[PDB]
Swiss-Prot record, chain B:
The lineage of its organism: Eukaryota, Metazoa, Chordata, Craniata, Vertebrata. Detected in forebrain. Detected in dendrites of neuronal cells. Expressed in the pyramidal cell layers of CA1 and CA3 and in the granule cell layer of the dentate gyrus. It is found in: Cell membrane; Postsynaptic cell membrane; Postsynaptic density membrane. Residues 1-376 are extracellular. It comes from Rattus norvegicus. Ionotropic glutamate receptor that functions as a ligand-gated cation channel, gated by L-glutamate and glutamatergic agonists such as alpha-amino-3-hydroxy-5-methyl-4-isoxazolepropionic acid (AMPA), quisqualic acid, and kainic acid. L-glutamate acts as an excitatory neurotransmitter at many synapses in the central nervous system and plays an important role in fast excitatory synaptic transmission. This is Glutamate receptor 2. Glycans are attached at N232, N346. The postsynaptic actions of L-glutamate are mediated by a variety of receptors that are named according to their selective agonists. This receptor binds AMPA (quisqualate) > L-glutamate > kainate.
Length: 354, 376
């Protein structure tokens, strides 16, 4: 039979939607068909997000794949928790209690703290914006006081030589451009770029003026799964799949493809347990208070969190709060030849060289 | 005539509701009154906040008075901006700009930064609560490089959490190992003594500490030097009990029966309750001149109308928004005036210290000048 799911995409997230579509084809099975209902909206607009969520809810969707941002994350978490509708997302993870949110993106805070320690930094700047949450800010401040670090933590998000940049890609360019412009000790700087897409396109087109640059990567192109994927992705018709026909894939797009794998696996597992996922009967007003307890929702959430598969972002496994666990983050440096992996980080071993 | 308004109150805002009711009596006249419809909600729950806001929208109110927190502020700003219904609030003011929001609460960050400079601090602990918000901490961290401040930031919002032992370890390392004696407390006003009590059991030579209470209600709770272990204590106050307007209010408020008016029968009023009373004055002054629309029937609201009904035409809603922002009155929180984004301007924050005889005003911070001025 067909299983209804929702898709909540930001306007302009073209590559991610192409990755979603490619995943829908790749992970298709004879057992059931995933029938997606797509909405494109401004995810920063909580009213619009509410409208889209309610639309999906009323179509009886069994799960929603989508994105949020700092302004709408609370709408998503509260509506998911209230209605027992699972939201699977490549957006920034959160540390709070968020039943019914499955976060495809691994937490970077631990790898970042381990890297600062690996380079033996004790004095540095953390230049950040709030677009990916403030948990990383809090974690840096916590560790600073513990290890006697002197940290200069500046919010660059509202603006009209060891440096961590945890900000929008546009701002990285502006900041580095400024350092090279000043012309003082340009090569003596060391930037750590606090995101999971070191080699994703744009970042390494920046002229760093010979400074040291380090970062992180969750998609390992040496992986058999990934190289095989890229072999096909790199030859797709860009007209048909905007953002495709590239040698690399943004990590958010890779997580979107992986999310389709996770959803498919969850529904396969529910089918194996004879848990009904065919079609919801009558869904009342979305904004009914109190909300009606939808029973299947709890099992669907459990099944999504129970999934274990290997994808483009490596080993995928979740804890009871929908957070990635048992993952690995590759630590990268920009060498004179190009970006190179210098080691990796996992929960159990922290940072391991080579 | 009468104008219908919404009132959205969090659980535990008992005194604020009493102040709202007292305001409705004070500012009503035989010629004009507000007719409120009160909903009581979990402000931390965005789904519940959405339901409440939308039900008021459905009923057809001129404005909604209410509260939000860190988790629900985006619901309020997005809904009032989309539906074009004005929301007037004593909650923490938002860092950015958002139409259809009237912020009764003056910004605190400016006065706090100025007070740190005034005392010539160069090193201090900043005890914050992440569930409360980090905007003020961020302002302090942003200024720390330029001002040469060594800040040790500790989330005491985790003092009872799973991060509890981590929180105590942090307090211990700063107070015992690093001998920190300057402490900023950025927290709920009624949590000050609980946090201080913990600090006192952890630190040493506590009589020598200097706390700044980063909150607009310095005297909202008991201030007993003995409770502070003999330390210096500084803070901020927007309700000035020397003001005739305020002392007259308190003369009346102090005899209201406490069962009937929870939180009243006191010699002080919480700054949030004062702002709630002032909000009734602002709405009254804004609305008394607006068009007397044809007397219609008021009916229970349906939250689903947020999706079923169109937004209030912008040209209609903006007239109410502008009327609110144009109000200039004196209230319990002093001079009330708004900029084009609904932020308080031209306000004054009193700077207080706990002295021998009790809390005393030692100076003030005006929004126009943005420095601490010392009083004789
Ligand atoms: C949880 O995480 C770890 C990755 O840290 C996964 O364990 C690893 O699994 C891979 C297979 O995907 C192992 O690599 C293989 O090793 C053998 C011999 O050691 C080699 O000849 C093969 O060609 C291949 O490279 C890796 O050794 C292993 N690592 C550890 C530390 O055990 C595990 O599968 C993940 N489990 C789940 C449920 O996600
Ligand atoms: C010349 C230069 O850029 N130096 C920086 C130094 O701060 C850093 O920690 C080191 C680590 O490999 O290289 C980089
Ligand atoms: C009131 O605010 C306006 C700015 O909008 C300014 O010109 C004036 O100085 C302020 N008045 C007082 C008394 O501070």
């Amino acid at each position: 039979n067909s299983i209804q799911i929702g898709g909540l995409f930001p306007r302009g997230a073209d590559q991610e939607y192409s990755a979603f579509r490619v995943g829908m084809v790749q992970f298709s099975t004879s057992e059931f068909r995933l029938t997606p209902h797509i909405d494109n909206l401004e995810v920063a607009n909580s009213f619009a997000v509410t409208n889209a969520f309610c639309s999906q809810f009323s179509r009886g969707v069994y799960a929603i794949f989508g994105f949020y941002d700092k302004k709408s994350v609370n709408t998503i978490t509260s509506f998911c928790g209230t209605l027992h509708v699972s939201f699977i997302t490549p957006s920034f993870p959160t540390d709070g209690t968020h039943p019914f949110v499955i976060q495809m993106r691994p937490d970077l805070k631990g790898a970042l703290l381990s890297l600062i320690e690996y380079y033996q930094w004790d004095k540095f700047a953390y230049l950040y914006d709030s677009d990916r949450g403030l948990s990383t800010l809090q974690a840096v401040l916590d560790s600073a006081a513990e290890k006697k670090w002197q940290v200069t933590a500046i919010n660059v998000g509202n603006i009209n030589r060891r440096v961590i940049l945890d900000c929008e890609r546009d701002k990285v360019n502006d900041i580095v451009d400024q350092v090279i412009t000043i012309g003082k000790h340009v090569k003596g700087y060391h930037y750590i770029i606090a995101n999971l897409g070191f080699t994703d396109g744009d970042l390494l087109k920046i002229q760093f003026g010979g400074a040291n640059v380090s970062g992180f990567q969750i998609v390992d192109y040496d992986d058999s799964l990934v190289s095989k994927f890229i072999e096909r992705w790199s030859t797709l018709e860009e007209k048909e799949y905007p953002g495709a026909h590239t040698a690399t894939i943004k990590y958010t797009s890779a997580l979107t493809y992986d999310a389709v794998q996770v959803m498919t696996e969850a529904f396969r597992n529910l089918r194996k347990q004879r848990i009904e996922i065919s079609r919801r009967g009558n869904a009342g007003d979305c904004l009914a208070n109190p909300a009606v307890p939808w029973g299947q929702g709890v099992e669907i959430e459990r099944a999504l969190k129970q999934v274990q598969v290997e994808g483009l972002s490596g080993n995928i496994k979740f804890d009871q709060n929908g957070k990635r666990i048992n993952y690995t983050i590759n630590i990268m440096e920009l060498k004179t030849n190009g970006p190179r992996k210098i080691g990796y980080w996992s929960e159990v071993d922290k940072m391991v060289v080579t």
